[PDB]
Amino acid sequence: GERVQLAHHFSEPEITLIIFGVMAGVIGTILLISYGIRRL
Amino acid sequence: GERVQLAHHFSEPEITLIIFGVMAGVIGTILLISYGIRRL
Amino acid sequence: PLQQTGQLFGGLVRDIRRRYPYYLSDITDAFSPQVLAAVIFIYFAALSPAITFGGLLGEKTRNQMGVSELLISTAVQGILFALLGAQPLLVVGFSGPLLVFEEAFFSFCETNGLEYIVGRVWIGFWLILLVVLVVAFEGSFLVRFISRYTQEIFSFLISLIFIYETFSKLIKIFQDHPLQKTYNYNVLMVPKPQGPLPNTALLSLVLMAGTFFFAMMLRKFKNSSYFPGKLRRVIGDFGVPISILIMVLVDFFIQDTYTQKLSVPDGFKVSNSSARGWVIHPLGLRSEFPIWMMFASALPALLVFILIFLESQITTLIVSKPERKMVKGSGFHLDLLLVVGMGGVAALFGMPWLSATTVRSVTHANALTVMGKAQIQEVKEQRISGLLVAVLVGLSILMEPILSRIPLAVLFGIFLYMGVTSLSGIQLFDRILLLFKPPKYHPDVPYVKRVKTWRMHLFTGIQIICLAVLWVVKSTPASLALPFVLILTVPLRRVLLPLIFRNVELQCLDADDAKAT
Amino acid sequence: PLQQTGQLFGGLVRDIRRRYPYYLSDITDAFSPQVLAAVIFIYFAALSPAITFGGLLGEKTRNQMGVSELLISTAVQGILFALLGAQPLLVVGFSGPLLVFEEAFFSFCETNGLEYIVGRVWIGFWLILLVVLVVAFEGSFLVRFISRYTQEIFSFLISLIFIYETFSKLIKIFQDHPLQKTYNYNVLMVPKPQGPLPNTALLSLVLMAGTFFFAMMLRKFKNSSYFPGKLRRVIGDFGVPISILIMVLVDFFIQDTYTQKLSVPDGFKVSNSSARGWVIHPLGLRSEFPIWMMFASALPALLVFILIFLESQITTLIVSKPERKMVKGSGFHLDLLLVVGMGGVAALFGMPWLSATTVRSVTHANALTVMGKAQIQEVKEQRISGLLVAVLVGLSILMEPILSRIPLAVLFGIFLYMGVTSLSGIQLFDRILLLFKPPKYHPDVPYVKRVKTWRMHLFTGIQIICLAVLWVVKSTPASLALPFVLILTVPLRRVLLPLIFRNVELQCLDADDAKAT
Ligand SMILES: CCCCCCCC(=O)OC[C@H](COP(=O)(O)O[C@@H]1[C@H](O)[C@H](O)[C@@H](OP(=O)(O)O)[C@H](OP(=O)(O)O)[C@H]1O)OC(=O)CCCCCCC
Ligand SMILES: CCCCCCCC(=O)OC[C@H](COP(=O)(O)O[C@@H]1[C@H](O)[C@H](O)[C@@H](OP(=O)(O)O)[C@H](OP(=O)(O)O)[C@H]1O)OC(=O)CCCCCCC
Ligand SMILES: CC(C)CCC[C@@H](C)[C@H]1CC[C@H]2[C@@H]3CC=C4C[C@@H](O)CC[C@]4(C)[C@H]3CC[C@]12C
Ligand SMILES: CC(C)CCC[C@@H](C)[C@H]1CC[C@H]2[C@@H]3CC=C4C[C@@H](O)CC[C@]4(C)[C@H]3CC[C@]12C
Ligand SMILES: CC(C)CCC[C@@H](C)[C@H]1CC[C@H]2[C@@H]3CC=C4C[C@@H](O)CC[C@]4(C)[C@H]3CC[C@]12C
Ligand SMILES: CC(C)CCC[C@@H](C)[C@H]1CC[C@H]2[C@@H]3CC=C4C[C@@H](O)CC[C@]4(C)[C@H]3CC[C@]12C
Ligand SMILES: *[C@@H]1O[C@H](CO)[C@@H](O)[C@H](O)[C@H]1NC(C)=O
Ligand SMILES: *[C@@H]1O[C@H](CO)[C@@H](O)[C@H](O)[C@H]1NC(C)=O
Secondary structure: OOOOOOOOOOOHHHHHHHHHHHHHHHHHHHHHHHHHOOOO | OOOOOOOOOOOHHHHHHHHHHHHHHHHHHHHHHHHHOOOO | OOOOOOOOOHHHHHHHHHHHHHHOHHHHOOOOHHHHHHHHHHHHHHHHHHHHHHHHHHHHOOOOOOHHHHHHHHHHHHHHHHHHOOOOOOOEEOOHHHHHHHHHHHHHHHHHOOOHHHHHHHHHHHHHHHHHHHHHOOHHHHHHHOOHHHHHHHHHHHHHHHHHHHHHHHHHHHHHOOOOOOOOOOOOOOOOOOOOOOOHHHHHHHHHHHHHHHHHHHHHHHHOOOOOHHHHHHHHHOHHHHHHHHHHHHHHOOOOOOOOEOOOOOOOOOOOOOOOOOOOOOOOOOOOOOHHHHHHOHHHHHHHHHHHHHHHHHHHHHHOOHHHOOOOOOOHHHHHHHHHHHHHHHHHOOOOOOEEOHHHHHHHHHHOEEEEOOEEEEEOOOOHHHHHHHHHHHOOOOOHHHHOOOEHHHHHHHHHHHHHHOOOOOHHHHHHHHHHOOHHHOOOOHHHHOOOHHHHHHHHHHHHHHHHHHHHHHOOOOHHHHHHHHHOHHHHHHHHHHHHOOHHHHHHHOOOOOOOO | OOOOOOOOOHHHHHHHHHHHHHHOHHHHOOOOHHHHHHHHHHHHHHHHHHHHHHHHHHHHOOOOOOHHHHHHHHHHHHHHHHHHOOOOOOOEEOOHHHHHHHHHHHHHHHHHOOOHHHHHHHHHHHHHHHHHHHHHOOHHHHHHHOOHHHHHHHHHHHHHHHHHHHHHHHHHHHHHOOOOOOOOOOOOOOOOOOOOOOOHHHHHHHHHHHHHHHHHHHHHHHHOOOOOHHHHHHHHHOHHHHHHHHHHHHHHOOOOOOOOEOOOOOOOOOOOOOOOOOOOOOOOOOOOOOHHHHHHOHHHHHHHHHHHHHHHHHHHHHHOOHHHOOOOOOOHHHHHHHHHHHHHHHHHOOOOOOEEOHHHHHHHHHHOEEEEOOEEEEEOOOOHHHHHHHHHHHOOOOOHHHHOOOEHHHHHHHHHHHHHHOOOOOHHHHHHHHHHOOHHHOOOOHHHHOOOHHHHHHHHHHHHHHHHHHHHHHOOOOHHHHHHHHHOHHHHHHHHHHHHOOHHHHHHHOOOOOOOO
8 A cells, every 4th residue: 555554454455345345245135035024 | 268368368258259250251362263164 | 752843942941841740749749768768778879979979079189178068068969959950860969070170170179270179150151051051952852862871881881890999999998907917906986096006998898898788689589589569669669778777787786896887077068267258259269360270161061061961861861761761751951951050159168079970870860769579660759858858958967976887888889789689680791691691591681582693792792892991991091081981972873883793683682661672 | 318218228229329339420520610610619617617626625635535536537437438439429527516525534534533535445446336227227217207397497507696695795895905095015925825915806797798798799790680690690600719818918018917727737747746646546545445434435426416417408308309409319318338437547647536517517508509590500510629729728737838828717708708697597486577577578488478477477486496496405404405406396296286286387388209109
């Protein structure tokens, strides 16, 4: 980045991949729930 | 008039009356000549 | 009215019997707000050129004739012309060719050591003799040989000159106060600023543009479909006074910035008290007047008579066209007689002679014109408007605090509005616009549907060459020969044009009442 | 296109199949000079607000987000939207409500000691989640409940705001350099003049008025009957570039006077190198980011989504009206998805999110509109124009010598022209004009010949109260509640209006395609 930045366990690509994976999991769970409803 | 003006024998009303009389005489002579022509 | 009766003073008597029965209507027809709006318009439109020409005359003649004499002469001649003239819609005032003649005559008197004002007195004396002979022999009947060709060429040239002078005054204002990074904040203001000042030229341009924009927008609002019709027409009639008031207030609320204002003399006194008085002796003021110059004054008097005759008669032709709905008649012999006689009389008092100016009279006629539901309906023909304009011009000295707060830039926008609005009724201007249009967009007019497009464009281009020639003559020291070159168009119309155009083509292109042959 | 299919991502797929077959036409339809003229128009019309908003954002956020980041985000989002969007005529850029939200969020982060840019990163992360759910469930179908009522109210309010800001910038210029009798000729110019300067405000006003006048005159010349038709239409299409070039040259030839110019950053670098880099760590830059703010960012993300959704969808409704001859279709689901996704991605890079602005997109559509022999004939729907505009916005840094000589006053006149031309297609503006007209002058339209005059005037006045309420909300610190008050007009149209107006009256006054019920 710029100047001095606090060091984290996860780098920027790693943390953004984790966040995108969590978002994809949430979206998939919501889609599966919506698919389950309107059928039974 | 204004300031110092050269003195004349005829004052302004007198000279303008003389000039108008001469003009009227000339106009009358021209009119009489025009009346004489176009008839004989 | 242009017919030759053959009787001595026959034209003069016919003009009197034509209009004087309508004298009672000439007072009652002014009971309308449009007449008051026209009075307010023509008051400025005649006062500002009068002030400018008086200042120039005082500068170029060592104040022998100046602003005060010109204003008093304008007031007296306008009052007498409104009370006794046959076409009261004409505005009597000073003009540019008259100023050029005054410059030339002052130079001639200075070279030969002659008294300029006494020479003017003798010229005016010779002016009275010439006009009476013309009226007695009905010499004004020669005006019937001036067709729409010469009238429209002269009107277009005069409007172009007016617009050019209006823009050149703004250019001179910009030159006097140029746009610079730094300015001297300590500059003497009395009598005029001796150095460039900030924000002056730009504010003058802003005021002129705003005045022109407001005038044009209110003129459009007159023909617009907004507001109730009565209130809409009332606002449209007062469009120029409203624009003038708005821009004057805008300049008034800007205290810090300097803008040039109207300047009038302190009182009713001669411009140079050390040069001459109110009455100038025809025999001489300081030195005895030579005998030979008394008879030699006829030729300058002849030139003055030619200039005034052409200007006044062509202006009367323009304002009294049948297509303008003039249903009261005009007198060519009576108006010319009155104008030249008043000029000769005012010459005796050391006051400039005047002429019926084209722009002011056309603007006065247009301001009194009532538009129907596009189509001209009627004209508010009355004597009250010109009389009130002359009275206000005479009283302009007494209302100095009101005039001292009016910028010239607002008047410049008013002049530009007058110039652009004076081109509406000219077919030459319309055919010039047709040079930049496809043939299918030409309006349904007799000179388009009966004449080939290239023939009409050639006919228009012939007039353009005449306009260029007249413009060249103006920009030369021999600018007093302009009436002769203008007269030379009549042989072009009556002799040279039929050699290249057919009779039907000339009847369609040059029609006295816009008829299809 | 607004129907609900019931299938997951059903709207997204339908929008893709609607427009992507026309992709080949979307490149070949740009082979015309009108497209190039529209590119030149929209380049300035998007660059100048981008520069102004970037400067304001840098001032109000301590340069954490500034001109360079906003320009780069605008370029990237415009390129991706032109290449992949379903309505390429929309212009993607920053807007005022977004700036207000940025101010509020910066204040909130400063109060609680939170990192503003990381909070923006988390908001953009929450932005991606919200939009995908809306697209999956076809949440964009709710746009069909926004009738012509709300669309025209929003468009009229936004045009009024644009004109008001354009005039207020000139007022601020006048306040910075007031008209004074004396000025300090030694004033430091770097970075900005620290004191009043002569001839600055007046020249800015002159340049703005001249730009507006030239733009309006060339727009009239497009519809005029002068010149050959092909050359006339070519000149009319390039009217805005011609006016900009003329006024820029006029200012260029005035060396001494100072006028504010366009300012761009020196290079493609972050605005504050000591604050953040190109990639901002979601876990924190200086301090560890709190866990609670990661979940609490949804509500500001909800507000941003509401703002962007309303702006983009109402703009799409305005530009895709059936009366505008849009014969290629628009995708509400795809465009919203792309805009919000690009905003969320640009949040990660420390760049501002954007929205489809009403004024810029309407001007872009009008610049590509071909007028028949009055009547709209077709629209030059193509992707090349927006792509070129985004490319030129991105390259604006590299063309600093060209942009450094362009005054803001010319851009102010361009903004005024855009504001006055954005009111043509609004029936609310037309019915406001009918308040100042007699009933017999009303045009032959279904809402006049089938509705009483006083009923129509009451219906117009109801919208005027809504406009006043929306204007009041803007002038309050709670200006972010404007979308909710705008939405509240829909219950007024669907519930309260039928209680006082008949079904036929509402169908005539509020018609989706201007039909007589
Ligand atoms: C401030 C004015 C008063 C405000 C109070 C508001 C109350 C108010 O002003 O209504 C009275 C009056 C309605 O009366 P009305 O419509 O019949 O008046 C007609 C109108 O004057 C037309 O201009 C006339 O046609 P034209 O021009 O000669 O061709 C027409 O005459 P005609 O030829 O058909 O025989 C007139 O009948 O107003 C209006 O004029 C409508 C425009 C109002 C616009 C709103 C006013 C700004
Ligand atoms: C500088 C240009 C060249 C100068 C050289 C001067 C030589 C010169 O330019 O003449 C050629 C051409 C004449 O050809 P022409 O009059 O037939 O051309 C018509 C003209 O283009 C109309 O605009 C068209 O209608 P629209 O607009 O589509 O509705 C019309 O098409 P249509 O619809 O009827 O089928 C065209 O036929 O010029 C002009 O256009 C007249 C205006 C010239 C004005 C003077 C040019 C400034
Ligand atoms: C055209 C009008 C003015 C009339 C024509 C002018 C000629 C014919 C007349 C009119 C007035 C006349 C002058 C009137 C008075 C005098 C004073 C006298 O001691 C010498 C002759 C002299 C100076 C006259 C010379 C001739 C004169 C100038
Ligand atoms: C000179 C500038 C200002 C204007 C140029 C326009 C003029 C010269 C052009 C425009 C339209 C042209 C006309 C168009 C059509 C024809 C028909 C053809 O069978 C003979 C020539 C003629 C009659 C042309 C003559 C020249 C013309 C009148
Ligand atoms: C709406 C999108 C962004 C997903 C919803 C956000 C929630 C559910 C998720 C997404 C990313 C997650 C973070 C990812 C990584 C870490 C580092 C770990 O040492 C502590 C938990 C923490 C800080 C997580 C907290 C919960 C978190 C913020
Ligand atoms: C409020 C300002 C801005 C505009 C004023 C104009 C409005 C209020 C005026 C102008 C014309 C008027 C109408 C003219 C004629 C009639 C017919 C009459 O039988 C009932 C009233 C009605 C229908 C009027 C209602 C009020 C009206 C619509
Ligand atoms: C008045 O005229 C005299 C010459 O007679 C001249 O010296 C003087 O300058 C003039 N006055 C003005 C104000 O020009
Ligand atoms: C950049 O941010 C720091 C705080 O991190 C601030 O002190 C500095 O003024 C900013 N730079 C500019 C140019 O504003």
